[PDB]
Design an enzyme around this catalytic site. Structure first.
Site, PDB file in Angstrom:
ATOM      1  N   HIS A 115     -11.541  21.658  34.295  1.00  0.00           N
ATOM      2  CA  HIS A 115     -10.239  21.845  34.937  1.00  0.00           C
ATOM      3  C   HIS A 115      -9.890  21.662  36.415  1.00  0.00           C
ATOM      4  O   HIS A 115      -8.716  21.634  36.855  1.00  0.00           O
ATOM      5  CB  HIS A 115      -9.651  23.288  34.329  1.00  0.00           C
ATOM      6  CG  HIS A 115      -9.624  23.305  32.872  1.00  0.00           C
ATOM      7  ND1 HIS A 115      -8.880  22.520  32.008  1.00  0.00           N
ATOM      8  CD2 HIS A 115     -10.555  23.989  32.024  1.00  0.00           C
ATOM      9  CE1 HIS A 115      -9.257  22.830  30.772  1.00  0.00           C
ATOM     10  NE2 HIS A 115     -10.169  23.541  31.004  1.00  0.00           N
ATOM     11  N   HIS A 130     -11.247  30.218  30.483  1.00  0.00           N
ATOM     12  CA  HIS A 130     -10.394  29.157  29.842  1.00  0.00           C
ATOM     13  C   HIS A 130      -9.040  28.875  30.252  1.00  0.00           C
ATOM     14  O   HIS A 130      -8.263  29.671  30.822  1.00  0.00           O
ATOM     15  CB  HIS A 130     -10.507  29.865  28.333  1.00  0.00           C
ATOM     16  CG  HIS A 130     -10.015  28.951  27.191  1.00  0.00           C
ATOM     17  ND1 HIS A 130     -10.280  27.661  26.843  1.00  0.00           N
ATOM     18  CD2 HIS A 130      -8.595  29.007  26.669  1.00  0.00           C
ATOM     19  CE1 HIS A 130      -9.861  27.180  26.020  1.00  0.00           C
ATOM     20  NE2 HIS A 130      -8.689  27.890  25.608  1.00  0.00           N
ATOM     21  N   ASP A 159      -5.594  28.163  29.208  1.00  0.00           N
ATOM     22  CA  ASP A 159      -4.628  28.345  28.032  1.00  0.00           C
ATOM     23  C   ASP A 159      -3.341  27.581  27.942  1.00  0.00           C
ATOM     24  O   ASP A 159      -3.149  26.896  26.912  1.00  0.00           O
ATOM     25  CB  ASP A 159      -4.217  29.864  27.885  1.00  0.00           C
ATOM     26  CG  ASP A 159      -5.422  30.795  27.565  1.00  0.00           C
ATOM     27  OD1 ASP A 159      -6.485  30.285  27.386  1.00  0.00           O
ATOM     28  OD2 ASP A 159      -5.331  31.931  27.527  1.00  0.00           O
TER      29      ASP A 159
END
Length: 124
Positions: free
Chosen positions: A12, A119, A121
């Site tokens: 990311h 993570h 989301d």
């Protein structure tokens, strides 16, 4: 193996460009971050901010998680992000993606010590 925090960075983070500069950004980035090795990852988001800025989100707005856990945080500010979504016709080895550039708040799950993103989301 690769820790969840390290995987979050690889999947990311894009701290080297301020935004996606061409419609080909996703095709290139998805391969450069090894997200199309044995399967085209269907959807992914890259955040064009420093790692520090994204890590700081873990001490910003605590919000509910879809999975009911209490470790999700929303950034107070919008961030430059690029959404990548595999096209309906795409297939290995040449995975094809649609690139979408926007400025939105990100929502991440945090864990560990240090307490960092593990993570991605959603973006709002």
């Amino acid at each position: 193996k690769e820790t969840a925090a390290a995987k979050f960075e690889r999947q990311h983070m894009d701290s080297s460009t301020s935004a996606a500069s061409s419609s080909n950004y996703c095709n290139q980035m998805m391969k450069s971050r090894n997200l199309t090795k044995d399967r085209c990852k269907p959807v992914n988001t890259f955040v064009h901010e420093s790692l520090a800025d994204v890590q700081a989100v873990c001490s910003q707005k605590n919000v509910a998680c879809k999975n009911g856990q209490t470790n999700c945080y929303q950034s107070y500010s919008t961030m430059s992000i690029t959404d990548c979504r595999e096209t309906g016709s795409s297939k290995l080895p040449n995975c094809a993606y649609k690139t979408t550039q926007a400025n939105k708040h990100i929502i991440v799950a945090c864990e560990g010590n240090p307490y960092v993103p593990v993570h991605f989301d959603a973006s709002v």
